[PDB]
Design an enzyme around this catalytic site. Structure first.
Site, PDB file in Angstrom:
ATOM      1  N   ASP A   1      68.624  -1.826 -75.257  1.00 44.56           N
ATOM      2  CA  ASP A   1      70.070  -1.905 -74.893  1.00 44.56           C
ATOM      3  C   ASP A   1      70.917  -2.363 -76.097  1.00 44.56           C
ATOM      4  O   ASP A   1      70.912  -3.578 -76.435  1.00 44.56           O
ATOM      5  CB  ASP A   1      70.266  -2.884 -73.742  1.00 44.56           C
ATOM      6  CG  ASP A   1      71.711  -3.093 -73.375  1.00 44.56           C
ATOM      7  OD1 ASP A   1      72.505  -2.179 -73.669  1.00 44.56           O
ATOM      8  OD2 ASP A   1      72.017  -4.164 -72.807  1.00 44.56           O
TER       9      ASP A   1
ATOM     10  N   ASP B   1      76.320   2.416 -76.040  1.00 44.33           N
ATOM     11  CA  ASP B   1      75.583   1.450 -75.176  1.00 44.33           C
ATOM     12  C   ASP B   1      74.303   2.127 -74.642  1.00 44.33           C
ATOM     13  O   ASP B   1      74.372   2.806 -73.607  1.00 44.33           O
ATOM     14  CB  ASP B   1      76.521   0.934 -74.091  1.00 44.33           C
ATOM     15  CG  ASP B   1      75.899  -0.112 -73.178  1.00 44.33           C
ATOM     16  OD1 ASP B   1      74.682  -0.401 -73.372  1.00 44.33           O
ATOM     17  OD2 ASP B   1      76.631  -0.653 -72.316  1.00 44.33           O
TER      18      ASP B   1
END
Ligand SMILES: *[C@@H]1O[C@H](CO)[C@@H](O)[C@H](O)[C@H]1NC(C)=O
Length: 337
Positions: A38, A223
């Site tokens: 992430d 992201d």
């Protein structure tokens, strides 16, 4: 910064085009976990054996047991980690983590509080933050900085390939490079607004013909831990009115038969227009006028200081192979294959 001649790759599983995760080992002997990598966060965590089984999420996930690891080092500092879709809580521990080729001593969260919504919907166990030390909760050194310190990676960069959904590779992270097998043409680069966040200036969002969004400029968080493209509640209710889509609880839907003729959506990043076709952003699960098809674009109001911002998640990265360049603080995009 010391550079070696190592590239290391992590193989990912693609669950339903929404969850992309790979495996790490923690401790001696290794305890294996499924984790999302992430770029939108900076901490490592996995569920802890100290998680009460009254958290049903802790019944259904792999739990780290410090009592089975000879390489564990106690710390015990409490922390809480706030994600877009929910929150986890626990305490810091140190152990040896294996990711691709690489063995690294790493500080990580043992999670003892893991809410059923949303973690009972997670095929993965935890998270490896690929963000910067500036956003790390408890100022813990992130795993990629610890790996860079070893001076074995050829370049101070990492790269994401996310496939469309037995035999197929779900995706691939390259630590210390890019895999030219998964992109074509040239990288186009955008500089970070600043070190500390994988966030770039965006100059406009088009629906077909017209720049009807982000006309005066806005932020794009790139992201890797977000399933979808996200904008603010206000940006998205405009986008979705222009697409003729309706709100379900958390997402937007269109009659399945209208999906294939929805217009192109373009994101203006650095020099170029990054264009998604309806096939790129519709879960085209049927062509019936009598079924609803979900869109891979939804509302997310990311709190300051990072947000308000768009987030370019897996919907975007499926089309554009993404390189995250810490050396030159920039993001490269190329056309995935
Ligand atoms: C926990 O880790 C931090 C970061 O290295 C350290 O400075 C702190 O003293 C540690 N605490 C304990 C109680 O082991």
């Amino acid at each position: 910064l010391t550079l070696g001649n190592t590239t290391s790759s992590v193989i990912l599983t693609n669950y339903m085009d929404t969850q992309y995760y790979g495996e790490i080992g923690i401790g001696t002997p290794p305890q294996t976990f499924k984790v999302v990598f992430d770029t939108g966060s900076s901490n490592v965590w996995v569920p802890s054996s100290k998680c009460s089984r009254l958290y049903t999420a802790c019944v259904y996930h792999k739990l780290f047991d410090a009592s089975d690891s000879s390489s564990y080092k106690h710390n015990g500092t409490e922390l809480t980690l706030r994600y877009s879709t929910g929150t986890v809580s626990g305490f810091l521990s140190q152990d040896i983590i294996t990711v691709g080729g690489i063995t690294v001593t790493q500080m990580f969260g043992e999670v003892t509080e893991m809410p059923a919504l949303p973690f009972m919907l997670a095929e993965f166990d935890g998270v490896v933050g690929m963000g910067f030390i500036e956003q790390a909760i408890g100022r813990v050194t992130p795993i990629f900085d610890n790996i860079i310190s070893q001076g074995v990676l050829k370049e101070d960069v990492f790269s994401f390939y996310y496939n469309r959904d037995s035999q197929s590779l779900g995706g691939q992270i390259v630590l210390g490079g890019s895999d030219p097998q998964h992109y074509e043409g040239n990288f186009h680069y955008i500089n970070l607004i600043k070190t500390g966040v994988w966030q770039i200036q965006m100059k406009g969002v088009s629906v077909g013909s017209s720049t009807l969004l982000c006309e005066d400029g806005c932020l794009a968080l790139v992201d890797t831990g977000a399933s979808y493209i996200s904008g603010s509640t206000s940006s998205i209710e405009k986008l979705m009115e222009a697409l003729g889509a309706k709100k379900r609880l958390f997402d937007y839907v269109v009659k399945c038969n209208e999906g294939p003729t929805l217009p192109d959506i373009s994101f203006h990043l650095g020099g170029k227009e990054y264009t998604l076709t309806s096939a790129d952003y519709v879960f085209q699960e049927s062509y019936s006028s009598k079924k609803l098809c979900t869109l891979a674009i939804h509302a997310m109001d990311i709190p300051p200081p990072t947000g308000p911002t768009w987030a370019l998640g897996a919907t975007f990265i499926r089309k554009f192979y993404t390189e995250f360049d810490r050396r030159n603080n920039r993001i490269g995009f190329a056309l995935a294959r």
